[PDB]
Each structure stands twice: as structure tokens, then as C-alpha cells.
């Protein structure tokens, strides 16, 4: 006698085409799943689909009757863009937030989601379970890890109306939030149909006569997708290259699939040069899948009218790089990286999938005097921050000849308003004068306790620091929840009682350091790296130092303010409060844990700070971001040569010696060493730096070198000048300074003069303005051509020569005076 709730929930999910959720507890879950599949199959025959099964590393007879796909947790990326009738998760030890999102969105509506839990006497042991991720965050300085994600995961099962926590012998648990589910009325679909379906049938048959719309539009499944297809084709049909269509929606809405049909329409419309740009070739798996689907709807013949060129040479062997069409005249569909903007000088259509993830300058150069298609993801898994989307939307409007924007709401695989989708979005959190503001430390125990007040703030703070991420990674939530030493700080204004304060800025601080001299020397003699810390474990390796790792410090993992209050002062003010705080300036029912709840908003005054020596931040170098860090008295110590592939910017590490009463000389050695490294390294992979940006780093690094008085530079004597330049070199300089010689001859002297000036030897003798320093820096250490410098400075080439010659007569006169005197 099976319980009647399981058949009731299964029928409810199938009738409305919304996913159902189940969790099995026990060591004999094989009996449960086969009974679950029996109920699902005995009530409907349209669900005999693939049963996705994921593990890290009778039932025997039944597994040989239905299609089962076994996919590894690390290999779950291969099932992207697919559809399965049931998702199964077996090993709890490896279901990260990223994996949970990936294996859930690939389930069709009306299916089942079943999660396998190992044999348990009671469910109270799940909150303290070990994982495969706390093993990452273990450090010798901070080892103990408190598991909080499992606490939130088990408490959130009650907030899902389609979740049934089933048992080994088919029994329901009180923690399940769907125990009170009532059966739906019997379906009546013989004549009555959903209004969206009637609207979808209306638009399909209305344009059936017209071609190529009549054949392509049958591929659409939603009204929102269909309206995008007409919007795309309408731009194509005008045969005018002054259009631009921007599409934004969530993940799983069909923007990429609708993008492919738009491209297939353009091919049939007589378009020769078609280009696709995307952050990764992986994102084009579905886009190129529906181009062929659209081609099949157009009755194109394989190996006769089109060919598929697969770029199997690189690691992404499955990626499609080019498709050639030779029906009447040779038409082509080429996939290029966003950086390759030179090929687009002859194009007619550019499709930019996931344009939000592309850096804004790349999109700016990608768009030209042709037709551009754009798609973006604003919510859901792998979403984008609201700030970058706003920047992209505003930028396109400035360029506007015609721009049209559309949106998609209804999903494809599951009905809108899905219960499991809402539960997962909530679980992963996918979607005043500064002087009066005060910083508050957020207690992580109450924050992730799934309390209604706690949950509301968690959504606000999560959306605060993911508002600028190029891609939304849910694994960061696992990081904050289960970190051993990460502390969360929020800056709020003066807020009255009864109203939760609005987070104006969120700072995540990780405690780093306390490295024993044995541990550093053990691994500095090898190539292995625990990578528990970043700032102490990099400066020690980069500088081959032994004392810095022994210090104790903090790493600013993430700092973000509200996008509405940007450039107002709520970020710098939070940093100063955080800096002063570390300076010691402030002296089987499983209900939510109502007890053991400390004040969520524990003020900094009532908590004693730790004794810290420095604060460090590792961040992607940008001119605006660097200016903010330098304002907070940070000095660079490191700057990675290999620019990040996704963003195109170099990682920069800054360290501030916040502790007062301590020697500011251990950092003076680090800043000086980097400063002398930067000058010589300005020609290796730093040649692409703008002159102004590279100058600012040099000034900041030089300022940091002044923390140590022993690093003060000495003047240049006459004896040193003679050792550096032969009399032939001097006579060349005098003639050029008089305007009697071309500048090309005196060009080998750039490294000598520029190094002398920027190392401080010539800095006090001759004073140069901001513009002259930038030209000398580029010509001397970046080895930039004059024409390249003229373009970058937005100045004529002759004017650059005039400024450069001004630099010489200042240097030439001092050199002559030094030798003569």
C-alpha cells in the first residue's frame, strides 16, 4: 500500500507541465526509484525519456529497460543544451551549487527530480557533513570549517511546494514542504487549450504563406520566442545595414535557439558575410544546433548545399568554427573571437551571443556600419550583473541608426512559474550622507539559517556583489557559507527600528597569513602550492621572501556598492571603517533554528578585532579601479603578465600596512623591488598598457618605495653620466636638442634616459609634467612608435615630437651642466 501523495504530486506535475522534486533517504533507495518510475510510467506514456544520473566515482532488471545516461560531476558540462525526463543525483559529497544548477535546468516539464541520500538514522547529521569543497578551504592557519550550506539546503525543502522528502519504504518526512499538496482537477484538453498555445498557433499559421518565415516559424515553442523571430527577420528583410537588435532574458528562455533561426533566415535572404562572436565556443552549441535545424526546415541538403567545418584542432574539438553555403553564390557563417575586429570590415551581419559577458570596449569595436544581433542573459544560472547590462544598453543607445530591444519570459523546457525553478533560484540566490553611515558585521550563522528576515537580507547582499560579475557563479555562495575564516561586512546608514537596513556596500574579508617558516620553505623548495592563501603565498613565491608569509593579514575578497549609489562614497567609507576596525579603533521535524542565533547585525564595537599587519587585495587591473585602491593608500606588489583571457586585464595585488606603531619598511622593500621590475617589464606583455595607465602604476609603486627611507634614490654624479654615455652619444644629444638632427638617430638612448628618470636618479634634477612623463615612459620603457603614441594621445604626430624634444632639452641641459660643473 503506497502512500497516495506520490501519485498525486506526479499527476500534478505532469498535468501542468511543471517539474516535481523528491529526496530519498536510506541505503536501499533502489526500491524507491523503481516504484517512482512505475507510478510515472503507469500514468503517462510520454515520459519514457532519458534518465540523467550523476555520480562522482528488481533494480538490476529495471535499469536494462529504460535509457540511462551516467555523467560525472566534473563532466556535467557535456549535457549542456540537452533534455532529460528525470534527473538523479546520488553522491551528496559533490553536488556543488554550480552542479545543482546545471543538472536541474536540463529537465523537461512534468518530469521528476530525485536526490539520493545515504542511509541515516536521523537527519540531524546532514548539517555537519563533510564535503569535497571544505577540503579546499582548509588552511594551516585556519583549519576548522563549519558547514552551513547543508543547513540551508535542508531547511529550504519546506519552502518548495513540489518537494517530497520520501523515505526508503515510501514514507514522507515533516521537513517536506509538499506534504499538504491537494490533487488538481482532472484535465480537460480535448477542446480547451491554453491561451498561449492558441496564440502560438495563430502566429504560425498567419505567416505560413510567407517564406522563409513559414518553414522557420514552426521551430518556435513560445510566443516570446516567436516575437523575437519576427523582430530579427524584420531587420533582415529591410536589406538595410543600419539596424541593431538587442535581446535580454534569463537562461533557458531560448535566446540562443531563436538566434540560430534568425541566422538561417539571413542565409535564405541572400546574406554572404555572416559572423558570430561569443565569449566561448561552448555557448554556441545550441546556436549552431538550431542553425542546422533551421536549415533542415529550409530543406537544405547536407554535403550538397552546406558544409560543417569543425575546429577539432584546439581543445574544443566539438566546437563548430565555420559553415559554408554554396547554393547560388558562396555564403558563409564564420565564428570569430571578439578580439578579431579586423575581419568585420566586409561583413553584413554580426551575431554577438552573450554580449554582456564580452567586455564593453570589445563590443564597441565589434559594432560597425552593418547589421548587428545581440543576446544577453540577465537572470538565472550563469547570469550577468545589472551594472554591466546597464552599461551595454546605454552604450548602444549613444551609438544610435535604428535600435530595437525585446525580451523573453516564458521558459522552454518547463512551464512558467515552475516550483523547482523558484526553489533553486531562491536557494542559490540567483535572483544618505556617508558620514552618517556605519559599518556592520554580519553573523554567518544567522545569515544562512533560512529565517524569513535573514533570507531577505541574503538576497540583497548576494545581488549586491554579483551586480558586476561577468558570469554568475553560484559556487561563491558555497564559499561564503562554508568558509573557515571569511568575514562579511556591510555598510548601512542610520536606519530606524522595524526596518531592515539597505546594504549600501558589502565587503568580504578573508583572514590570511600565519604561515610557519617550515611550511613556506617546504613548498618554496618545490613546485607544489596549497593555494589556501593568495597574497602571502604569492609575495613569498614572487619575491623569494621568508618573513612576509609569517605575517598575519586580511584579503578583501570582494567589495561592491549599490549600483544606484556608485561614485558617491559608500565604498571608500566602508574601506576606511574596515581599516580602522582592524587598527583597534573600536574598543523527524527539522525546523529553522530559532535558538542559538547571535545578533545578525553585531556592531564592530562589541567584537574585538584580530591583530593584523596588512590588508591585501587581488583584482583585475582597470584605470578606474586602480585609482580607488590608490586613494585608500594601497601600493602594488605584483602584476601578472598573462592577461586574463575572459576579461583581457592583468591581475594586480596591492598591500597596505594598516597596523600603526609597526615598521613600514618590510613593504618598502617589496614596492621598490616591483618598481624596478615594472620598468624593465613594461616591454614584455605590458606594451599594450596605455601611457597614462602605466604611468599611474609607476607613480604609485614609487610612492610605496618611499615607505623605506633606505630606498631613497641618490643624485646622478658626473662620473656616473660619463660611464653611461660615450662622447659620441653626448654629441648626438646636443645636436638633436638644437633641432639639427632627426629624432630616429637618438632612439637607442631611450632605455638609459627613461630608466634614469623613473628610478629617481634624475627625478629631482629635472621636473617633468604629467604629459611629458607619459610620452617618455612609453618611448623609453614601452618602446611605442610615435604614430601609435599619437593615436593613443589623440594628438598629431608632430605635436608628440615637439613634446619629446621638450623632454630632451631639459635632460640635455642638465647633462651638460653636470659634466661642465
Ligand X SMILES: CC(C)(COP(=O)(O)OP(=O)(O)OC[C@H]1O[C@@H](n2cnc3c(N)ncnc32)[C@@H](O)[C@@H]1OP(=O)(O)O)[C@@H](O)C(=O)NCCC(=O)NCCSCC(=O)Nc1ccn([C@@H]2O[C@H](CO)[C@H](O)[C@@H]2O)c(=O)n1
Give contact residues for ligand ADP (rule: CB under 6 A). 81-83, 219-221, 225, 251-257, 286, 412
Q: Is 225 labelled a binding residue?
A: yes
Judged by beta carbon distances under 5 to 8 A according to partner kind, the member of ligand ADP, ligand X, a copy of itself, none in contact with residue 412 is ligand ADP
Q: In whole angstroms, how close is the CB of 261 to ligand ADP at the nearest point?
A: 7
Query: CA–CA distance from 329 to each of 325, 335, 629 (Å)?
Result: 8, 20, 56
Q: Is 16 labelled a binding residue?
A: no
Residues counted in the chain: 821
Angle, CA 654 vertex, CA 648 and CA 657 arms, to 5°: 175
Distance CA 171, CA 21 (A): 15
Q: Is 560 labelled a binding residue?
A: yes
Question: Residue 285 or residue 761: which is nearer to a copy of itself going by CB?
Answer: 761
- Kindly provide the residue ranges of all beta strands, DSSP E only, lying in 473-611, ordered along the sequence: 486-492, 505-513, 552-561
Judged by beta carbon distances under 5 to 8 A according to partner kind, the member of a copy of itself, ligand ADP, ligand X, none in contact with residue 705 is none
Distance CA 604, CA 577 (A): 9
- Spatial contact of 67 and 53, defined as CB atoms under 8 Å apart: no
Q: Which of 426, 633, 647, 735 binds ligand X (CB under 6 A)?
A: 647
What 8-state DSSP symbol labels residue 47?
Answer: T
Q: Does 377 bind ligand X (CB under 6 A)?
A: no
Q: What sign has the CA pseudo-torsion 111, 117, 120, 125?
A: negative
Q: Is 256 labelled a binding residue?
A: yes
Those residues with Cβ within 8 angstroms of residue 662's Cβ, 6 or more apart along the chain or in another chain: 613
Q: Which of 342, 499, 595, 611 binds a copy of itself (CB under 8 A)?
A: 342
Judged by beta carbon distances under 5 to 8 A according to partner kind, the member of ligand ADP, ligand X, a copy of itself, none in contact with residue 251 is ligand ADP
- Spatial contact of 450 and 150, defined as CB atoms under 8 Å apart: no
727 phi and psi, to 5 degrees?
Answer: -55, -30
Chain breaks in the chain (C to N over 2.5 A) after: 57, 400, 431, 587
Q: In whole angstroms, how close is the CB of 388 to ligand X at the nearest point?
A: 8
Q: Is 559 labelled a binding residue?
A: yes
Q: Which range binds ligand X by CB under 6 A, 294-302, 525-533, 568-576, 590-598? A: 568-576
Q: Which of 367, 506, 749, 818 binds a copy of itself (CB under 8 A)?
A: 749
Q: Does 783 bind a copy of itself (CB under 8 A)?
A: yes
Q: What sign has the CA pseudo-torsion 680, 686, 692, 695?
A: negative
Q: Is 180 labelled a binding residue?
A: no
The 586-625 site mask, x for binding ligand X (CB under 6 A), equals -------------------------------x-xx-x-xx
Distance CA 382, CA 472 (A): 4
C-alpha dihedral over 784, 761, 636, 546, to 10 degrees? 120
Judged by beta carbon distances under 5 to 8 A according to partner kind, the member of ligand X, ligand ADP, a copy of itself, none in contact with residue 257 is ligand ADP
- Spatial contact of 441 and 604, defined as CB atoms under 8 Å apart: yes
Distance CA 48, CA 85 (A): 7
Q: Which of 55, 62, 601, 628 binds ligand X (CB under 6 A)?
A: 628
Q: Is 631 labelled a binding residue?
A: yes
Cell of 685: 606583455
Q: In whole angstroms, how close is the CB of 96 to ligand X at the nearest point?
A: 16
Q: Does 16 bind ligand X (CB under 6 A)?
A: no
Question: Residue 624 or residue 820: which is nearer to ligand X going by CB?
Answer: 624
Angle, CA 557 vertex, CA 552 and CA 562 arms, to 5°: 135
Those residues with Cβ within 8 angstroms of residue 791's Cβ, 6 or more apart along the chain or in another chain: none
Judged by beta carbon distances under 5 to 8 A according to partner kind, the member of a copy of itself, ligand ADP, ligand X, none in contact with residue 751 is a copy of itself
Q: Is 705 labelled a binding residue?
A: no
Q: Which range binds ligand X by CB under 6 A, 214-222, 446-454, 465-473, 585-593? A: 465-473
Q: Which of 47, 272, 552, 618 binds a copy of itself (CB under 8 A)?
A: 272
Question: Residue 470 or residue 743: which is nearer to a copy of itself going by CB?
Answer: 743
CB atoms within 10 A of CB 268: 22
Cell of 559: 567589495
Q: Which range binds a copy of itself by CB under 8 A, 223-231, 265-273, 357-365, 444-452? A: 265-273
Question: Residue 196 or residue 724: which is nearer to a copy of itself going by CB?
Answer: 724
Q: Which residues of 605-639 are buried (b: 16+ CB within 10 A; e: fewer)?
A: eeeebeebbbbbbbbebeeeebebbbebbbbbbbb
Distance CA 246, CA 355 (A): 9
β-strand 331-336 against 438-442: which pairing, if any? Answer: unpaired
Q: Which of 218, 401, 731, 767 binds a copy of itself (CB under 8 A)?
A: 731
Distance CA 426, CA 104 (A): 14
Judged by beta carbon distances under 5 to 8 A according to partner kind, the member of a copy of itself, ligand X, ligand ADP, none in contact with residue 281 is none
Distance CA 127, CA 142 (A): 20
Distance CA 627, CA 693 (A): 10
The 522-551 site mask, x for binding a copy of itself (CB under 8 A), equals --xxxx-------------xxxxx------
Q: In whole angstroms, how close is the CB of 58 to ligand X at the nearest point?
A: 48
Those residues with Cβ within 8 angstroms of residue 120's Cβ, 6 or more apart along the chain or in another chain: 25, 26, 126
- Spatial contact of 228 and 355, defined as CB atoms under 8 Å apart: no
Judged by beta carbon distances under 5 to 8 A according to partner kind, the member of ligand ADP, a copy of itself, ligand X, none in contact with residue 254 is ligand ADP
The 313-332 site mask, x for binding a copy of itself (CB under 8 A), equals ---------------xxx-x
Q: Does 172 bind ligand X (CB under 6 A)?
A: no
Count residues binding a copy of itself (CB under 8 A). 54
Judged by beta carbon distances under 5 to 8 A according to partner kind, the member of ligand ADP, ligand X, a copy of itself, none in contact with residue 560 is ligand X
CB atoms within 10 A of CB 34: 14
Helices (H), 367-451: 386-399, 419-428, 444-447
What 8-state DSSP symbol labels residue 512?
Answer: E
655: closest CA among 694, 724, 705?
705
Question: Residue 128 or residue 644: which is nearer to a copy of itself going by CB?
Answer: 644
Q: Does 586 bind a copy of itself (CB under 8 A)?
A: no
292: closest CA among 278, 310, 272?
310
Question: Residue 64 or residue 346: which is nearer to a copy of itself going by CB?
Answer: 346
Q: Does 303 bind a copy of itself (CB under 8 A)?
A: no
Residues 498-557 that bind ligand X (CB under 6 A): 556-557
Query: CA–CA distance from 698 to each of 606, 640, 777 (Å)?
Result: 41, 15, 9
Q: In whole angstroms, how close is the CB of 741 to ligand X at the nearest point?
A: 23
Judged by beta carbon distances under 5 to 8 A according to partner kind, the member of a copy of itself, ligand ADP, ligand X, none in contact with residue 469 is ligand X
307 DSSP β-pair partners: 324
Judged by beta carbon distances under 5 to 8 A according to partner kind, the member of a copy of itself, ligand X, ligand ADP, none in contact with residue 221 is ligand ADP
Q: Does 285 bind ligand X (CB under 6 A)?
A: no
Judged by beta carbon distances under 5 to 8 A according to partner kind, the member of ligand ADP, a copy of itself, ligand X, none in contact with residue 620 is ligand X
Quick one: which H or E segment has residue 134? helix 134-137
Q: Does 468 bind ligand X (CB under 6 A)?
A: yes
621: closest CA among 637, 643, 604?
643
List contacts with a copy of itself (CB under 8 A): 270-273, 328-330, 332, 334, 342-343, 345-346, 348, 524-527, 541-545, 641-642, 669, 673, 676-677, 679-681, 683-685, 687, 726, 728, 731-732, 735, 739-741, 744-745, 747-752, 783, 785
> Would you list which residues are annotated within the binding site for Mg(2+)?
256, 353-354
> Would you list which residues are annotated within the binding site?
81, 219, 225, 252-261, 286, 353-354, 413, 559-561, 566-572, 631
List contacts with ligand X (CB under 6 A): 468-470, 556-561, 566-572, 617, 619-620, 622, 624-625, 627-628, 647
> Would you list which residues are annotated within the binding site for ADP?
81, 219, 225, 252-257, 286
Amino acid at each position: 500500500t503506497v502512500d497516495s501523495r506520490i501519485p498525486t504530486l506526479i499527476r500534478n506535475g505532469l498535468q501542468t507541465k511543471k517539474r516535481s522534486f523528491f529526496v530519498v533517504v536510506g541505503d536501499h533507495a533502489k526500491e524507491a526509484i523503481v516504484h517512482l518510475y512505475y507510478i510515472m510510467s503507469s500514468m503517462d506514456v510520454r515520459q519514457n525519456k532519458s534518465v540523467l544520473w550523476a555520480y562522482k566515482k528488481p533494480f538490476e532488471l529495471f535499469i536494462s529497460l529504460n535509457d540511462i545516461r551516467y555523467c560525472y560531476y566534473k563532466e556535467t558540462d557535456k549535457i549542456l543544451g540537452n533534455t532529460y525526463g528525470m534527473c538523479i543525483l546520488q553522491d551528496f559529497e559533490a553536488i556543488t551549487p554550480n552542479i545543482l544548477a546545471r543538472t536541474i535546468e536540463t529537465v523537461e516539464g512534468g518530469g521528476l527530480v530525485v536526490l539520493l541520500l545515504k542511509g541515516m538514522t536521523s537527519l540531524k547529521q546532514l548539517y555537519t557533513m563533510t564535503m569535497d569543497v571544505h577540503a579546499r578551504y582548509r588552511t594551516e592557519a585556519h583549519d576548522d570549517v563549519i558547514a552551513r550550506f547543508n543547513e540551508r539546503f535542508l531547511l529550504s525543502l519546506g519552502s518548495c511546494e513540489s518537494c517530497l522528502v520520501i523515505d526508503d519504504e515510501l514514507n514522507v518526512l515533516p521537513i517536506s514542504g509538499g506534504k499538504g499538496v491537494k490533487p488538481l482537477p482532472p484535465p480537460d484538453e480535448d477542446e480547451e487549450l491554453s491561451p498561449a498555445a492558441k496564440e502560438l498557433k495563430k502566429i504560425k499559421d498567419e505567416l505560413e504563406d510567407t517564406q522563409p518565415i513559414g518553414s522557420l516559424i514552426k521551430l518556435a515553442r513560445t510566443v516570446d520566442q516567436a516575437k523575437a523571430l519576427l523582430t530579427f527577420v524584420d531587420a533582415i528583410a529591410e536589406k538595410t545595414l543600419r539596424n541593431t537588435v538587442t535581446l535580454t532574458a534569463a537562461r533557458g528562455r531560448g535566446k540562443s535557439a531563436a538566434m540560430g533561426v534568425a541566422i538561417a533566415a539571413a542565409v535564405a535572404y541572400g546574406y554572404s558575410n555572416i559572423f558570430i562572436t561569443s565569449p566561448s565556443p561552448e555557448n554556441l552549441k545550441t546556436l549552431f544546433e538550431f542553425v542546422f535545424k533551421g536549415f533542415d526546415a529550409l530543406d537544405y541538403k547536407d554535403h550538397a548545399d552546406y558544409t560543417i567545418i569543425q575546429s577539432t584542432n584546439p581543445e574544443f574539438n566539438k566546437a563548430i568554427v565555420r559553415v559554408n553555403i554554396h547554393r547560388n553564390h558562396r555564403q558563409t557563417i564564420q565564428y570569430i573571437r571578439p578580439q578579431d575586429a579586423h575581419v568585420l570590415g566586409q561583413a553584413e551581419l554580426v551575431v554577438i551571443d552573450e554580449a554582456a559577458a564580452i567586455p564593453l570596449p570589445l563590443v564597441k569595436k565589434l559594432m560597425g556600419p552593418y547589421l548587428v544581433f545581440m543576446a544577453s542573459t540577465i537572470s538565472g544560472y550563469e547570469g550577468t550583473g545589472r551594472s554591466l547590462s546597464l552599461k551595454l544598453i546605454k552604450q548602444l543607445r549613444e551609438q544610435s541608426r535604428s535600435l530595437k530591444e525585446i525580451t523573453l519570459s516564458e521558459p522552454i523546457r518547463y512551464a512558467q512559474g515552475d516550483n523547482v525553478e523558484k526553489w533553486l533560484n531562491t536557494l542559490l540566490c540567483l535572483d544618505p550622507d556617508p558620514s552618517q553611515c556605519e559599518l556592520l558585521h554580519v553573523n554567518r550563522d544567522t545569515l544562512f539559517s533560512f529565517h524569513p528576515v535573514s533570507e531577505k537580507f541574503l538576497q540583497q547582499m548576494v545581488a549586491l556583489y554579483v551586480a558586476s560579475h561577468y558570469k554568475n557563479s553560484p559556487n561563491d555562495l558555497q564559499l561564503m557559507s562554508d568558509a573557515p575564516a571569511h568575514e562579511l561586512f556591510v555598510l548601512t546608514g542610520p536606519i530606524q527600528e522595524g526596518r531592515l537596513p539597505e546594504p549600501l556596500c558589502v565587503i568580504q574579508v578573508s583572514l590570511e597569513g600565519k604561515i610557519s617558516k617550515q611550511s613556506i620553505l617546504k613548498s618554496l623548495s618545490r613546485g607544489q602550492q596549497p593555494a589556501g592563501d593568495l597574497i602571502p603565498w604569492l609575495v613569498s613565491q614572487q619575491f623569494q621572501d621568508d618573513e612576509f608569509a609569517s605575517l598575519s593579514g586580511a584579503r578583501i575578497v570582494r567589495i561592491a556598492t549599490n549600483p544606484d549609489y556608485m561614485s558617491m562614497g559608500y565604498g571608500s567609507k566602508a574601506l576606511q571603517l574596515l581599516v580602522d576596525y582592524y587598527e583597534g579603533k573600536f574598543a523527524d521535524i527539522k525546523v529553522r533554528d530559532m535558538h542559538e542565533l547571535p545578533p545578525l547585525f553585531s556592531k564592530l564595537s562589541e567584537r574585538r578585532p584580530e591583530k593584523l599587519d596588512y590588508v591585501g587585495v587581488s583584482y583585475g587591473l582597470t584605470q578606474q579601479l586602480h585609482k580607488f585602491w590608490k586613494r585608500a593608500q594601497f601600493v602594488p606588489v605584483y602584476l601578472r603578465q598573462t592577461a586574463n583571457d575572459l576579461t583581457g586585464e592583468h591581475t594586480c595585488v596591492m598591500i597596505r600596512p594598516l597596523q600603526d606603531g609597526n615598521d613600514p619598511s618590510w613593504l618598502g622593500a617589496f614596492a621598490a623591488d616591483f618598481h624596478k621590475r615594472f620598468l624593465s617589464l613594461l616591454s614584455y606583455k605590458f606594451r599594450e598598457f596605455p601611457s597614462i595607465l602605466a604611468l599611474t602604476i609607476e607613480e604609485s609603486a614609487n610612492a610605496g618605495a618611499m615607505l623605506d627611507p633606505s630606498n631613497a634614490p641618490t643624485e646622478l654624479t658626473k662620473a656616473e653620466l660619463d660611464q653611461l654615455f660615450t662622447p659620441f652619444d653626448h654629441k648626438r644629444l646636443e645636436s638633436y636638442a638644437n633641432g639639427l638632427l632627426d629624432y630616429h638617430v637618438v632612439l637607442d638612448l631611450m632605455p638609459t634616459i627613461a630608466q634614469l628618470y623613473f628610478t629617481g636618479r634624475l627625478r629631482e634634477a629635472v621636473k617633468l609634467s604629467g604629459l611629458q612623463q607619459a610620452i617618455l615612459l612609453a618611448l623609453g620603457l614601452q618602446r611605442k612608435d610615435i604614430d601609435t603614441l599619437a593615436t593613443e594621445l589623440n594628438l598629431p604626430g608632430s605635436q608628440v615630437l615637439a613634446i619629446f624634444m621638450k623632454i630632451m632639452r631639459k635632460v640635455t641641459q642638465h647633462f651638460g651642466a653636470l659634466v661642465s660643473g
